[PDB]
């Protein structure tokens, strides 16, 4: 039982570590993008009517 | 002995359920798709920067 | 005779499993940070999606 549970936890850790490495840069640049994009889209939308 | 085997199985299944959103291929696949759609859109916007600026 | 056979078989199995546990403990100190890493990863995804 102990060996089997340890093997599964190790696999889970490996998977989480690989994801953290790639998600951290995207979350940090999110808020400036969303705000710049929304302002841009609203400005563009006012020229079509 | 039989109780012990089934108890282990239960414990394993419980661990898998609790971590499925971040680990299972199904859920990870859905996140990929959403990200690819946005990429393509941004590529397009960057390609038409001049026209959009003029407008 | 049956009991003799069963005990011998189990002893052999116990030694084999002991060798496997000694190889797995050389990797585990760092586990005190799992639930925290999972929630961190989940939170990053929720923010992006």
What resolution in angstroms does the PDB record give? 33.0
Against chain A, the chains showing at least 3 CB pairs within 8 Å are B, C
Burial B3-38, CB ≥16 within 10 A → b, else e: eeeeeeeeeeeeeeeebebbbeeeeeeeeeeeeeee
- Measured between alpha carbons, how far is C41 from B33 in angstroms, rounded to an integer? 18
* Experimental determination approach used: cryo-EM
Residues 4-43 of A with CB under 8 A from C: 6-7, 9-10, 12-13, 16-17, 19-20, 23-24, 26-27, 30
Residues with Cβ within 8 Å of A12's Cβ and at least 6 positions away in sequence, in order, are B15, B19, B23, C34, C38
Residue C26's H or E segment, with its range, is: none
């Amino acid at each position: 039982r102990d060996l089997t549970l340890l093997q599964r936890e190790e696999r889970l850790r490996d998977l989480i570590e690989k994801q953290d490495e790639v998600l951290t840069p995207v979350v940090t640049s999110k808020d400036p993008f969303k705000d710049n994009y929304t302002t841009f889209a609203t400005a563009l939308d006012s020229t079509r009517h | 002995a039989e109780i012990n085997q089934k108890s282990l199985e239960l414990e394993l299944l419980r661990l898998e359920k609790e971590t499925a959103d971040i680990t299972h291929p199904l859920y990870l696949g859905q996140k990929h798709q959403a990200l690819q759609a946005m990429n393509s859109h941004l590529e397009a916007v960057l390609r038409e920067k001049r026209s959009l600026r003029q407008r | 005779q049956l009991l003799i056979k069963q005990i011998r078989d189990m002893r052999s199995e116990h030694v084999a499993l002991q060798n496997q546990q000694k190889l797995a403990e050389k990797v585990d100190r760092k586990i005190s940070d799992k639930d925290e890493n999972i929630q961190k990863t989940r939170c990053m995804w929720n923010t992006i999606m």
